Every structure is written in structure tokens, then in C-alpha cells.
Amino acid sequence: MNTVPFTSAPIEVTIGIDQYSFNVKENQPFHGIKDIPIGHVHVIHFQHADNSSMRYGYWFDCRMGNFYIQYDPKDGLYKMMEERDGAKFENIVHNFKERQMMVSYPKIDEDDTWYNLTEFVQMDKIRKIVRKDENQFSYVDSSMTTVQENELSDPAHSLNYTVINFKSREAIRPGHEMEDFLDKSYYLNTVMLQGIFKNSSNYFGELQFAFLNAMFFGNYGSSLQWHAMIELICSSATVPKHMLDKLDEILYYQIKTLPEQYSDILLNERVWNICLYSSFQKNSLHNTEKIMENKYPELL
Amino acid sequence: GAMNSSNYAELFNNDIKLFVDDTNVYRVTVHKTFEGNVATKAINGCIFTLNPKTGHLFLKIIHTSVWAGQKRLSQLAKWKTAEEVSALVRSLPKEEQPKQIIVTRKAMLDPLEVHMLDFPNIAIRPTELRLPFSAAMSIDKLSDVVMKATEPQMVLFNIYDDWLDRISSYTAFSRLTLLLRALKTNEESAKMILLSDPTITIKSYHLWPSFTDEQWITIESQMRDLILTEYGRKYNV
Ligand SMILES: Cn1c(=O)oc2cc(N)ccc21
Numbered sequence: 178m179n180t181v182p183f184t185s186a187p188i189e190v191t192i193g194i195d196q197y198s199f200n201v202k203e204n205q206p207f208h209g210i211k212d213i214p215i216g217h218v219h220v221i222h223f224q225h226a227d228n229s230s231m232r233y234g235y236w237f238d239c240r241m242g243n244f245y246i247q248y249d250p251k252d253g254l255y256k257m258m259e260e261r262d263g264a265k266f267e268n269i270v271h272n273f274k275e276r277q278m279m280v281s282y283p284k285i286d287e288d289d290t291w292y293n294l295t296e297f298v299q300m301d302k303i304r305k306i307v308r309k310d311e312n313q314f315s316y317v318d319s320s321m322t323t324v325q326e327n328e329l330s331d332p333a334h335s336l337n338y339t340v341i342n343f344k345s346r347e348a349i350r351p352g353h354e355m356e357d358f359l360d361k362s363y364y365l366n367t368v369m370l371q372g373i374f375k376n377s378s379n380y381f382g383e384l385q386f387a388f389l390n391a392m393f394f395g396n397y398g399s400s401l402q403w404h405a406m407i408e409l410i411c412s413s414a415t416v417p418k419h420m421l422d423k424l425d426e427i428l429y430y431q432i433k434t435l436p437e438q439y440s441d442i443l444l445n446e447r448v449w450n451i452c453l454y455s456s457f458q459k460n461s462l463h464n465t466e467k468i469m470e471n472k473y474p475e476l477l
Numbered sequence: 478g479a480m481n482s483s484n485y486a487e488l489f490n491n492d493i494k495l496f497v498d499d500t501n502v503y504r505v506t507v508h509k510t511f512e513g514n515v516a517t518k519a520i521n522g523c524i525f526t527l528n529p530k531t532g533h534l535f536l537k538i539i540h541t542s543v544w545a546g547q548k549r550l551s552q553l554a555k556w557k558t559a560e561e562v563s564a565l566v567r568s569l570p571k572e573e574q575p576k577q578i579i580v581t582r583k584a585m586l587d588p589l590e591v592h593m594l595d596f597p598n599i600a601i602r603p604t605e606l607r608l609p610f611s612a613a614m615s616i617d618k619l620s621d622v623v624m625k626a627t628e629p630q631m632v633l634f635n636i637y638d639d640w641l642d643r644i645s646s647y648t649a650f651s652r653l654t655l656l657l658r659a660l661k662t663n664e665e666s667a668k669m670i671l672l673s674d675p676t677i678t679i680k681s682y683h684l685w686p687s688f689t690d691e692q693w694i695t696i697e698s699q700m701r702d703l704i705l706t707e708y709g710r711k712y713n714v
Pocket residue numbers: 532533534535633634635
């Protein structure tokens with residue numbers, strides 16, 4: 178169990194860690210979060226009491242170093258930083274714990290939600306989507322645009338998701354125009370799985386990271402990317418059976434975890450109705466279909 | 478964007494563009510079988526690809542053989558249309574290739590777009606107009622060449638005959654849509670109007686009768702009256 182201390186909390190802010198969140202008052206004596214489960218990625222994220230715009234946050238993995246938070250009054254936000262001095266860091270953490278000024282990552286032992294939502298997400302892959310290689314953690318926010326969004330401006334701050342476009346040469350073999358547009362199996366399996374992602378665990382990991390970025394930051398281009406990756410699978414006649422079964426679990430926990438009041442902008446009517454009811458894979462998502470009908474029958 | 482009443486004059490500017498109409502590509506008769514069930518039999522069809530500026534009709538004839546052993550024919554019709562239109566553009570010298578292609582039915586957009594991926598600078602547009610090009614098979618000579626064909630075949634016709642020697646493209650296109658609109662709403666009366674006077678003949682290399690200017694006015698007037706009457710009948714106004 179690892180710790181992320183905070184130097185101070187000088188401004189009122191709602192702090193999130195994974196699917197949990199805590200309200201923190203201006204200059205309240207908050208000095209970090211402890212008992213963070215090791216073995217998964219995590220995200221710590223912020224929304225200032227004064228500006229409900231710009232949700233922002235940091236992906237990290239505690240095995241990659243000792244990380245802490247410090248408010249920067251020039252740039253006006255909570256920044257993640259790395260402490261390289263192991264002993265200076267154990268010292269801060271121990272002293273803060275002794276004074277009991279740290280909240281406890283509040284995991285119910287029966288709960289596999291965070292695992293289920295990050296099964297395939299790997300910190301090394303995140304850092305390739307969010308390129309900033311001086312840091313071992315990754316900053317995302319509400320307003321960052323994707324590479325594909327930029328093609329239709331500042332590349333250093335972009336989400337370098339894998340570009341998927343159903344009406345492109347990459348997706349359509351000459352001479353199989355109608356075939357490949359109606360049955361995307363060759364874009365999925367040959368182009369994307371074998372060619373670019375190499376295996377389905379990287380595909381699934383990008384899908385999961387996209388969803389989480391849409392949920393926690395309302396990042397609109399992440400939501401687009403998440404829908405695109407679902408639709409490519411659902412629109413393929415030929416999908417490995419191991420992938421369909423896992424997809425059904427993956428989507429189930431995403432729909433399960435989504436705030437009820439956000440289903441209107443985060444859920445794309447066309448994609449979901451096509452995947453669950455018209456696509457090749459209409460019958461292969463029983464768990465995702467049952468939870469979608471019992472929780473959001475309006476959208477459908 | 479979409480083509481509509483407002484941007485209508487754009488058809489006649491000097492940017493090359495083609496209309497594509499797919500209505501007559503896949504044509505069937507419906508009949509009963511020995512056991513009483515219903516069956517379709519396909520007849521030859523065609524793609525109606527027209528430059529509204531010159532009046533050049535690239536009439537691609539769709540032989541029934543293309544359907545042999547295929548399923549979901551009405552969906553395939555749209556792809557076969559897109560394939561043939563794309564092959565026509567590739568066959569044309571660069572200076573002749575269109576800058577726009579305007580599809581009369583929106584279902585053609587994705588098939589054409591996918592077939593034209595090699596032509597990123599050709600814009601594929603829908604339209605809000607209710608153009609009468611389905612009535613093209615009411616033009617005797619076009620219907621005849623389609624019906625007689627024994628193989629796939631492209632046939633080139635000027636749908637304006639020689640009108641452009643005397644009138645503008647704008648006027649020519651409006652005459653053409655008036656004639657086709659009439660043929661669509663009441664073929665029998667429309668055709669009666671065009672051939673009544675046996676002294677007005679159709680040139681061998683033409684589709685319509687050789688009316689003088691004043692006779693076209695009388696004709697155009699008779700076609701208007703036809704269209705308006707049929708509306709009253711349809712709706713009881
Ligand atoms: C010169 N010309 C004509 O009058 O009718 C044509 C049709 C086609 N497609 C190509 C050329 C012509």
C-alpha cells in the first residue's frame with residue numbers, strides 16, 4: 178500500500194482518486210492519500226470550488242516512483258511531482274501519517290470495480306498517448322484535444338489516441354470497398370489488432386483509458402475515441418471469441434460506473450443502438466445489454 | 478453542402494459537376510409462382526449520370542447478369558452504382574473529371590464516398606431537390622437501348638439535343654426537368670403532347686422533337702397545365 182502526500186491545500190477543491198472523491202476546504206490541513214492499492218494504475222484529479230470548468234488530473238503508478246502534490250500559485254493548480262530522495266520521502270509520509278492528516282483510499286474488499294475498469298491499462302501505454310517524457314505520470318484535462326480532432330492545434334498537449342476512421346483508405350481495401358465498409362473485420366483484425374495494437378490487451382487498454390478520461394474529465398475527444406473502438410468491434414462479423422466475452426465485461430463495468438446524470442453527453446445514441454441491436458455482435462453483449470436496458474432505456 | 482433552391486444557379490457555372498441518379502439501376506417485375514408465392518424477375522437497368530451544364534448523359538447500362546447469385550440486391554445496387562461512377566471518373570482525363578458529384582438519393586453518399594476515396598478533392602453532395610430523373614426510362618430511345626442490351630454497355634447521349642445552340646444551360650435544364658416532371662406524373666398524356674403533330678419529327682441523333690422556338694413555348698405551356706391538373710386530382714384542391 179502506497180502513499181501520495183500533499184504539501185498543502187491552499188484552495189477549496191474537490192479531490193478525486195479513482196472513483197472516490199473528497200471535498201477539501203481552503204487551507205484545510207489535508208496532506209495526502211494513503212493505502213493506495215499497488216498493482217494498478219491510478220488517477221488523482223481536481224475540480225476547483227471556484228471554477229467548475231477544467232477538471233484536471235494525473236495518471237500514475239506508485240511502483241514507478243514516489244509522487245506528491247503541491248499547489249502552484251503562479252500557474253494556479255495542484256501539480257504532481259516526483260521526489261527522488263527516498264529517505265526524505267518516507268520521512269514526510271511517516272510524519273504526516275503519525276499526525277493522521279491523510280485520508281485512506283477507501284476500498285471495500287468485495288469490490289473489483291477499479292480493477293475491472295483498468296484491467297488492460299498499462300502506464301507505459303498511457304505515456305505514449307500523453308507524451309511528456311520528463312515525467313513518469315501523465316496530466317490530462319477537460320479541454321485537451323486529440324490527434325484526430327486536430328486534423329479536422331498545439332501538438333505537445335494532445336491525446337495521441339490511435340486514429341480510427343471508417344471512410345479512409347486505411348480501413349478500405351481497394352476492390353473490397355463494399356465488403357470492408359459493411360464488415361470491418363479486416364480493419365479490426367489485420368490493420369488494428371495485428372498491425373498497430375499487436376494484441377487485444379493494448380486495444381482494450383486504450384479503450385479503457387479513453388472511457389476513463391471521458392468520465393473523469395468530460396474529455397469530449399476521449400468519448401469519441403471510446404465509441405469508435407466499440408463500434409469497430411461491434412461492426413466486425415469476425416471477432417475472436419475471447420475478445421467478445423471480455424468486451425461484454427469491460428463495457429458492463431463502464432456503464433455500471435458512469436454517473437447517472439451524465440448519460441446524455443457521454444453516451445452516443447447511434448453507436449449503442451447499432452452495437453446492441455443491429456450489429457454483427459448484437460447477441461454477444463448480454464451483460465452490457467441487460468444493464469443498458471434496466472438503467473438507460475430512454476436513450477435506446 | 479446539400480444542394481437546394483437557394484444554390485441552384487451553381488449547376489450552371491464553369492465548375493464541372495455531375496448528377497448521379499440510381500433509381501433505375503435495379504428494376505424488377507413482381508409476379509406469382511406456381512405455388513402461389515411472390516417472386517421478382519429483374520430487367521435491365523441503368524445509371525443516369527448527367528452534366529447539367531453541357532447536357533452529356535453517361536448512360537451506364539446495368540445488365541441483369543450483374544445480379545446473378547447475389548443477395549440484398551437493393552443494397553448492392555447502390556455499391557454497383559458507386560463502382561461504375563468511380564470507374565467513369567477514372568476513365569476521364571484529369572481536366573474532365575468533376576469537381577462535384579451530386580447524388581439524387583442520400584443513400585448513395587456512403588457508397589460513393591467510399592468508392593471515391595482515391596479522389597479526395599471531388600466533393601460528394603446530396604440534394605434537397607425532388608428531381609424527376611427516375612422518368613428517364615420514359616424517353617423512348619433511352620428505354621429502348623437499355624431493354625435491348627445483351628451485355629454491360631455505356632451509351633453517351635446529349636439530353637439537351639441541340640438546344641444549347643439557341644438557349645442557355647439554365648433554360649435547358651429547366652425545360653428538361655419540366656418534360657421529365659410531366660412524364661413522371663402522367664406519362665400517357667405527356668407523350669401524347671410530344672408526338673401529337675406527326676409533322677414534328679425527332680432527329681435520328683436526338684431524343685426529343687425538333688420544335689421551333691414558338692412550338693416549345695406551346696409545349697412548355699401544355700406540360701405545365703398537365704402537372705398542375707394532376708396535383709389537383711392527387712390532393713383534391
Ligand atoms: C459532345 N457531346 C454531346 O453532345 O453529347 C455528349 C455526351 C457525352 N457523354 C460526351 C460528349 C458529348
